[PDB]
Nucleic acid binder design. Structure first.
Ligand SMILES: [Mg+2]
Ligand SMILES: [Mg+2]
Ligand SMILES: [Mg+2]
Ligand SMILES: [Mg+2]
Ligand SMILES: [Mg+2]
Ligand SMILES: [Mg+2]
Ligand SMILES: [Mg+2]
Ligand SMILES: [Mg+2]
Ligand SMILES: [Mg+2]
Ligand SMILES: [Mg+2]
Ligand SMILES: [Mg+2]
Length: 228
RNA sequence: GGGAUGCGUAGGAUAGGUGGGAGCCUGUGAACCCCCGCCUCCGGGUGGGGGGGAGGCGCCGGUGAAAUACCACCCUUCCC
């Protein structure tokens, strides 16, 4: 069949006609985590926007109240003293334009890139075609470009996530782990939804949150009332 | 309501987008072989019947603008 026995059992646990409250889903989603690791919990929403126009894009970051339950390998590219501000903030890999060469050669061992605006000329032109397609190019809207490198790094290390609608008008984010207590999952989920709504495009017509789902890495989805 | 889509070059090859992902499937039957429906760019994709009887997939690496298992929300175009 299309799914293995493990996944089939999980499918029994969901009412496919029910719209769950966030509180309920918080509990349920933990039951939907039966893979052989501590599964990330995810939220997905179908947005009432035209992804074809940039002025109706939804893109930002939100600090999850309870963090991500995952460490983020952070590479910072900075010039001068900012190089130390970076290291001190806890950056995994630190460097200036010199390390651009490493990435040009194929080095990709990191999850997030942050940089001072003053290296963004080189980063953009040298790394743009490498980091861009990977959604790893530092960017104001992603909160990954700034002179306050240490504050950015700390926010990211503290559980700040980025979200950006895809070309189909959908949007997705990790919001914790199946090991989180349900109340904490619930908080993180709301935090994300709130951040989403704070980025509703003025021009967006009709229901913004057309649908909102919660799920686990390897499990089925649960449809939720975003305002619960 | 149900199901599949998606093929420049390179790449094992028909790579839809994004997000998750370090695991996934498998005596509730792997590889492999035969047959069939639908689709087909004639490569295959996808679903199923029969045989078979324990391995298969991903990661890694490689190619690439992008990387594949698995899962989720969607898109396009299509079927029932
Ligand atoms: Mg194509
Ligand atoms: Mg293509
Ligand atoms: Mg994917
Ligand atoms: Mg990814
Ligand atoms: Mg058999
Ligand atoms: Mg069989
Ligand atoms: Mg024959
Ligand atoms: Mg066929
Ligand atoms: Mg076949
Ligand atoms: Mg048999
Ligand atoms: Mg899922």
């Amino acid at each position: 069949p299309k799914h293995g026995k493990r996944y089939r059992a999980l499918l029994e646990k969901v009412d496919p006609n029910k719209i769950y409250t966030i509180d309920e889903a918080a509990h349920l989603v933990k039951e939907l985590a039966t893979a052989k690791f501590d599964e990330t919990v995810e939220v997905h929403a179908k947005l009432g926007i035209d992804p074809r126009r940039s002025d109706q894009n939804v893109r930002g970051t939100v600090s999850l109240p309870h963090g991500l339950g995952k460490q983020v390998r952070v590479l910072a590219i900075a010039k001068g003293e900012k190089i130390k501000e970076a290291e001190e903030a806890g950056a995994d890999y630190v460097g200036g334009e010199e390390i651009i060469q490493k990435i040009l050669d194929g080095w990709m061992d990191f999850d997030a890139v942050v940089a001072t605006p003053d290296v963004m000329g080189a980063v953009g032109s040298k790394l743009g075609r490498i980091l861009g397609p990977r959604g790893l190019l530092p960017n104001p809207k992603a909160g990954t470009v700034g002179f306050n490198i240490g504050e950015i790094i700390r926010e990211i290390k503290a559980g700040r996530i980025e979200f950006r609608n895809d070309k189909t008008g959908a949007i997705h984010a990790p919001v914790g782990k199946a090991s989180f207590p349900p109340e904490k999952l619930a908080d993180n989920i709301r935090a994300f939804i709130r951040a989403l709504e704070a980025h509703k495009p003025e021009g967006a017509k009709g229901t913004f949150l057309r649908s909102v789902y919660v799920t686990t890495v390897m499990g089925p989805s649960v449809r939720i009332n975003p305002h619960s």
